[PDB]
Design an enzyme around this catalytic site. Structure first.
Site, PDB file in Angstrom:
ATOM      1  N   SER A  33       0.259  -7.815  -1.280  1.00  0.00           N
ATOM      2  CA  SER A  33       0.228  -8.429  -0.176  1.00  0.00           C
ATOM      3  C   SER A  33      -0.408  -9.837  -0.070  1.00  0.00           C
ATOM      4  O   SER A  33       0.064 -10.873   0.561  1.00  0.00           O
ATOM      5  CB  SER A  33      -0.127  -7.529   1.119  1.00  0.00           C
ATOM      6  OG  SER A  33       0.242  -8.297   2.274  1.00  0.00           O
ATOM      7  N   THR A  48      -0.239  -4.835   3.827  1.00  0.00           N
ATOM      8  CA  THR A  48      -0.864  -4.806   5.405  1.00  0.00           C
ATOM      9  C   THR A  48      -1.626  -5.954   5.301  1.00  0.00           C
ATOM     10  O   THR A  48      -1.995  -6.606   6.503  1.00  0.00           O
ATOM     11  CB  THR A  48      -1.766  -3.661   5.677  1.00  0.00           C
ATOM     12  OG1 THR A  48      -2.642  -3.209   4.476  1.00  0.00           O
ATOM     13  CG2 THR A  48      -0.831  -2.512   5.897  1.00  0.00           C
ATOM     14  N   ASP A  49      -2.221  -6.306   4.285  1.00  0.00           N
ATOM     15  CA  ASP A  49      -3.036  -7.635   4.263  1.00  0.00           C
ATOM     16  C   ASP A  49      -2.697  -8.877   5.159  1.00  0.00           C
ATOM     17  O   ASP A  49      -3.344  -9.551   5.908  1.00  0.00           O
ATOM     18  CB  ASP A  49      -3.670  -8.202   2.915  1.00  0.00           C
ATOM     19  CG  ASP A  49      -4.006  -6.863   2.047  1.00  0.00           C
ATOM     20  OD1 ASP A  49      -3.178  -6.237   1.592  1.00  0.00           O
ATOM     21  OD2 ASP A  49      -5.412  -6.832   1.925  1.00  0.00           O
ATOM     22  N   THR A  65       0.800  -1.187   0.036  1.00  0.00           N
ATOM     23  CA  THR A  65      -0.038   0.017  -0.156  1.00  0.00           C
ATOM     24  C   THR A  65       1.148   1.151  -0.057  1.00  0.00           C
ATOM     25  O   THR A  65       0.566   2.277  -0.564  1.00  0.00           O
ATOM     26  CB  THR A  65      -0.789   0.064   1.339  1.00  0.00           C
ATOM     27  OG1 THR A  65      -1.630  -1.127   1.389  1.00  0.00           O
ATOM     28  CG2 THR A  65      -1.852   1.150   1.056  1.00  0.00           C
TER      29      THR A  65
END
Lengths: 325, 325, 325, 325
Positions: free
Chosen positions: B60, B93-94, B13
């Protein structure tokens, strides 16, 4: 003078002894009739005269859709009389995430429906069932406590079935909702209300199951780093109506999931994207497949889609259900 | 002379352009190489000597284990060089719940290792990627961050890989650990540590991935009302070497769930019981199958079992790690 | 074989009885004596060899530095003995913010010192006292609880005497540390430790009151919109040697406050700047009077200034104790 | 045909400046004007027709009640028109606890009235002001924001004024309401509501300061272990009209504090008891002096008392407002 209330039993911890003064270990839970409970707390009588029924005796881990069907119906049946002012329901701690939300979409009345339970066994040192039950009735008999939706009451708190859930594995204060907060609290024998639900429920509800035999089948598939495509082939090869993807981040998919979902949709299966984080809203994005859950959780999303499928099978309408409820 | 830090990129991101300004929902990740990120903040050169090299540049949610290895081997060989003080990895971030914990168990050096990510596109109105990067590097270049286990930086917070996870789906203060809190915080261009992880890690980890090339297969099954049992048969039929279960409370299992778990154990497959709540401890119970995860999340538990299986199979020894790592 | 510990009682909402059993509020605190408390829980005898000493019999809010100074002395030279492995203490919750932290700075031993309490009357339906007391002895009887600082056990959690505080007026889970978490958790008749405090305490502390009989007087002033400057005058005309400020933002000062502080400082007296928000850091700022409490609350800060002034008067040095303790 | 929205500026931390791009601790405040802040966010043009109007240039530390009474009226005057749809107010952060609740009791309308601020300077990296103002104008312009009560907007959240408060001292996500929650959120350029305030406000309010020139003075006295009584005379001897007691525990008063109270309640003023904990309700108690706040913090308790002292003086009457607002 006093109002008449009915207690409906299903088992649980509050009505379950262990084998020791401080035994909080895997024991046999839900072994108490509705007759004894009256005894243990004779202070209940000052609140309101009560009548009890026995709807079942099974662990909440094994609560099933068949029962929820028999429960919602009965509930509407008694709430319809003039000698029934409210209803309390004893239930298990493991699935209290689903059960109180299901009746929120199917009881057609303003008269109070309250769930209650306990984390500690009824023989544990400093057991909470007594006081949780005591306050669970008090709110039932209150006039002001009318027209607020199905309620859940534990640890001196009063929260709505649309937001609350069990956030911790074994603590006394597990149930809560970071973002949404509580409806009210019970302190010093008096009740204090603070907020109201801003979604459609109970009366304005469009869902009715007055005469439904069986609900559709809906599975839940988790989303992680190397998720299997074949996990999808199964539910499909078993003809389920819908699938709820509990995915990474805001419901993102891997090239293995983006694939399986499509395979499913083609077959006429409805899929919905929910999060695996435990809070927040999943927004829409045409770059990805499936429908999008609002801020409903995997567990509650299944409960919605299940009833949303007896009504229609049109995406657009379905999608619009998740944002209004 | 200033310190020597290298920044291994993966793109997520923090390095992903959006179509417009206020648009923070539709975008592409892993589109901007390291170099440019290095440019966006010329203030970074006041803290250390930066070096950067790309390795993944992918979203991610699509990262596999075969790639993790590559990373661990890569970082170890860079830490052994008498001219390198710390590392800083960028990631999405996932699945930032898994990745960090993996290196925290395989990296063999007390020198600092910091992960870093963002929640908005680098084109958002108030993008965080900028401040979070400067903030990550500041930490790595500290002489006191040594020997504290893998670190994750975001929103001016310093957290431990063993505890931190993404609790919300969209908010930027999403990463927290309700029961565990944070190791430190960065306020006013100053760092403040306050606690230390009290578990086994890094320098003292018995796991060493330096000579392997393929990890075992491990699936994840969910627990809910009416849950199917053909899910388990699916994994057994594909050779899974272990299964993580997301219980309904203290990891409870339903009638059908009890059944599936056993078929697997009866075939050489080891199964660990975790929890679907979010935080908390699953206790030991001889009234149910499989092992218990300490307080690890379904996601993190799966990572620890992969490694466990590359060194043993004695269930008894497996149980012990979960309690120490 | 069996460990043996001593119990020190000082009254509190855990020794209070009430007219009825449904009286949450309106009770007389400090009614029962240590004797009774042990007789209520026959399980304690299976964890250790207990003994008690009714040091006092009051209610939390009437505690005084006199009493504190005594209490610390009586525990020091009882942990010095060979027949004492640990000591548990009963106290009100109305000021449990101040008592534990005091000892955390003046006890010279690595042996367990546990503080305990309860939110509802001993006469109430589900008094939290019995179980709280059961766990307190449990953590004191353990040996892996050594060298961790002064502990405070309540509602199944183990919190550090430097971060914990009553965050809610009447709830039964009111003690918590939003940014630092808890040290360990008591579940299933087992204790699980997760972190360690990273600041000075007990054995390595430079504060010894063993030969002191009177501590300096310190006040506390609140900061709000129309805060008057005559409150400082009034404190100045009473002798006080230092004031803790409870500022609006991160210690922000008013015109009436600038004039205020500035006035007392010249009058030879130390003032620390703290915040009313209840958590966070208070950054230096050469452009604002007084010193800055690190992340200490007004009350914790007052406890650190009394002790501070017995060993010095230098502003500069006191300003380092606040960053290390 | 987008709406017309006015922006009343007061300065604050969202208008502050400094030297280096990394400055976030030593800067001047309010230094900028409403003019330039809009020049920074062009995308606003997309939402509505905007105007700006300066009313002050100080910081939240220096907000006197004089100004408030001035602001209170200019808003009413400005909302009674037809070419005015919604109005936004830029404020600091140190006293955003007060101001919003003041207007929430004096504005007589249903049109949106929202406050917005930022925790970082405008010159700071990843500054949070721009995205904040964007989301602020966003809500005002919307029509489903009427009749919901004064709103506070920061870091993507929409919380109520009767509940919101500055939790942490320096964090970017400070504003919370532990037990109450947020009313709505802003994700992906779309607004989501979920909760409604359940108390009397704006219209239904019984307070009007349209013909008021000066308000009554009210001071706050803190509560701690060895608290001074000479602190109550300081006020009594100065002509205070009211006193709010920030009591330890649930308003608990100490022997000294009990005297200072009666001492004053007898001279003539009114006194209310709140908590220093930060949340929860203070119950009624005949055994203790003074009135009881409901669950209002000392900060908010004052504003209410202060405005109620322009109407009646009867103790029993006032106690009834604290339960209703």
């Amino acid at each position: 003078n006093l109002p008449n209330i009915v207690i409906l039993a299903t088992g649980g911890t509050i009505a379950g002894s262990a084998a020791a003064n401080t035994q909080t270990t895997g024991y046999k839970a839900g072994a108490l009739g509705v007759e004894t409970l009256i005894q243990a707390v004779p202070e209940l009588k000052t609140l309101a005269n009560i009548k009890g029924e026995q709807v079942a005796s099974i662990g909440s881990e094994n609560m099933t859709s068949d029962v929820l069907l028999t429960l919602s119906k009965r509930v509407n049946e008694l709430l319809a009389r003039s000698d029934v002012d409210g209803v309390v329901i004893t239930h298990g701690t493991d699935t209290l995430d689903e059960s109180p939300y299901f009746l929120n979409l199917t009881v057609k009345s303003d008269k109070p429906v309250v769930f209650v339970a306990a984390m500690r066994p009824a023989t544990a040192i400093s057991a909470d069932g007594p006081m949780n039950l005591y306050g669970a009735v008090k709110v039932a008999a209150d006039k002001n406590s009318r027209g607020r939706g199905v309620l859940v009451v534990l640890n001196d708190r009063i929260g709505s079935a649309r937001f609350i859930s069990k956030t911790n594995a074994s603590t006394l204060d597990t149930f809560k909702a970071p973002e949404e907060g509580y409806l009210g609290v019970i302190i010093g024998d008096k009740i204090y209300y603070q907020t109201r639900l801003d979604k459609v429920h109970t009366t304005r509800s469009v869902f009715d199951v007055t005469n439904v035999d069986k609900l559709p089948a809906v599975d839940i598939i988790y989303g992680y780093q190397d998720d299997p495509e074949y996990m999808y082939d199964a539910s499909i090869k078993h003809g389920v109506k819908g699938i709820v993807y509990a995915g990474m981040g805001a419901g993102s998919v891997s090239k293995r999931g983006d694939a399986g979902i499509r395979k499913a949709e083609s077959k006429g299966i409805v899929v919905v994207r929910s999060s695996r984080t435990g809070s927040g809203i999943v927004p829409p994005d045409a770059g990805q497949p499936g429908l999008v859950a609002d801020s409903l959780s995997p567990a509650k999303s299944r409960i919605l889609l299940m009833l949303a499928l007896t009504k229609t099978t049109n995406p657009a309408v379905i999608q619009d259900y998740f944002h209004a409820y």
